[PDB]
């Protein structure tokens, strides 16, 4: 149901059906799934032990885990507890980040390398969805990112209930990697109007447009409204790359994509201050988007 | 609370206390968890695809895979069904059977990889255990081998209900892959008097002495009690490797460990013979192997 992109795959003559699979999937649906990612499943198994590690810390190890470098850090819960890190972009936060953490070296490490693997990884989706719009010359390396480690403590009272109500990230694009034995990832497939699993899938990533992304791209990919519903009583444990908006703050859609049957749908706005209209209004789910129009 | 045993480690000098810890894991628990056995995360994560594309297979390609040797193939359910394979420590066995499943090539490629490299971390887990009780030179590199790849299909009326009852393993060794998301493996600790969980730990395998491993050893290592309980409503899929008996059949302990303080404990058997004997008296969890005192 949710299409699967090969990120070695996409590119040009035979990569040009999985290009514009990628795009379609944008455009429709604000996600999909990535393989070929070329992240080694030994990074990846030795991730999930070491955030299973960080939040089996004890709860006075994990405070003192708490802004480690301005802003970021842990944070404390109502089942959710999370790591995060900003700005994930900037070599300079993620080495503070992983040297500060109170944790075992090898763990610090890992956090390290897996950080910078997922970057790489969300820079490389960018530049893939900003090539089947046409668009060639645009780095996105510089871009701010927020990395995040969470963790839902479910119970089996809480089995049933939305574990994370409807909303939109405010970013341009987020990268996920579910817990592979309790998925609970489902999105609004604005097609039908209805709630699509996104079943999680081993050593394959999610890949979420945000609002920035439908800003930038025009209108033309889809900022996708989901949730995360809890299946079991056990812990969800996830992971996230966020790609924000460019180094600059400003959002504004690029030349080639305002048409004459598609005019230009949003004035340039700073993304700090969308932030800050998320926050003002409760619109979190994209609503606030249209208070932005041209 | 089951022993973990590096095998990397484990050997002398810097060994000599893995080694023994080892031991003492057989002689107490018979149960123990193994690190460092060098099969590589990637194989792993392509053989759990693997192992449940066969299981997601259309019920007629699972009925030609019955039988595809002499034997061994699939075999159906209540809850439970497997594809087995015997000989697995035999090249020509297992060659056959993977050219012979109904499944797509990378499948057939996947479980051979699989069995080869399950088949070699046996019989290196047994040198150990043989060492470990001053025994070198033994070779179990022929012994036959039994490769089992299991599904229990649970659904929320099986929760809380056995997955299979208690009962020991007729054979030596048993190396288990258990799946990461659901356990259910339970071991009669004997220091404990009750059935404790050996909750599942992802890239690790549980190791279980048998029988055969407690006559062999001349009472030296314990044949331990295990079962699974259904802890959960989802399928639970697992992969065993059984080190079954000798090439020649025949049990029996070798000179070493049997001294005035521990004096021969069991008279000479074929293991055909004792399998027999456990089919035909229902005694599976080694009650039989009283009436083979000597
Ligand atoms: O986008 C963010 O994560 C920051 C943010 C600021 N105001 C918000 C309202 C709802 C959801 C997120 C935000
Ligand atoms: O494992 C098998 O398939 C054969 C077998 C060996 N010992 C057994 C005890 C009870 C039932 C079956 C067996
Ligand atoms: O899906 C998760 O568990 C975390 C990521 C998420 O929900 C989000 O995009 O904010
Ligand atoms: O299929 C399994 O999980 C193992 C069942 C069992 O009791 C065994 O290993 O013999």
Redesign the interface.
């Known amino acids: 149901e949710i299409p699967a992109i090969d990120l070695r795959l996409a590119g040009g003559g035979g990569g040009a059906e999985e290009t514009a699979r990628l795009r379609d999937a944008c455009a429709r649906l604000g996600c999909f799934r990535v393989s070929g990612h070329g992240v080694?499943?030994?990074l990846?198994?030795e991730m999930?032990?070491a955030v299973r590690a960080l939040f089996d810390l004890p709860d006075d190890a994990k405070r003192r885990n708490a802004d480690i470098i301005p802003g970021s850090g842990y944070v404390p819960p109502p089942l959710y507890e999370a790591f995060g890190l900003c700005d994930a972009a900037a070599p300079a936060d993620v080495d503070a980040f992983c040297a500060r953490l109170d944790a075992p070296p090898h763990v610090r490490e890992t956090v390290k390398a897996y950080a910078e693997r997922m970057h790489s990884l969300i820079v490389d989706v960018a530049g893939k969805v900003a090539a089947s719009l046409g668009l060639h010359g645009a780095s996105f390396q510089d871009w701010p990112c927020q990395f995040r480690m969470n963790r839902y403590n479910y119970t089996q009272d809480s089995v049933g209930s939305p574990g994370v109500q409807v909303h939109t990230d405010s970013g341009f694009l987020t990268v996920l990697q579910e817990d592979?034995?309790?998925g609970g990832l489902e999105v609004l497939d604005p097609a039908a109007g209805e709630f699509v699993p996104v079943d999680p899938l081993?050593?394959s990533f999610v890949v979420n447009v945000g609002d920035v992304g439908q800003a930038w791209s025009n209108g033309r990919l889809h900022n996708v409204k989901h949730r995360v519903q809890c299946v079991?009583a056990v812990p969800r444990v996830s992971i996230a790359m966020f790609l924000l908006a460019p180094k600059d703050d400003t959002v504004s859609a690029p030349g080639e994509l305002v048409d004459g049957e598609h005019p230009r749908r949003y004035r340039e706005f700073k993304y700090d201050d969308y932030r800050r209209l998320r926050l003002s209004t409760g619109e979190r789910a994209g609503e606030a988007l249209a208070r932005l129009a041209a």
Do not use: D, I, L, S
Request: with cysteine; aromatic share 0%; charged share 15%.
């Open positions: 080694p499943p030994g990846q198994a999930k032990a592979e034995c309790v081993p050593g079991a």
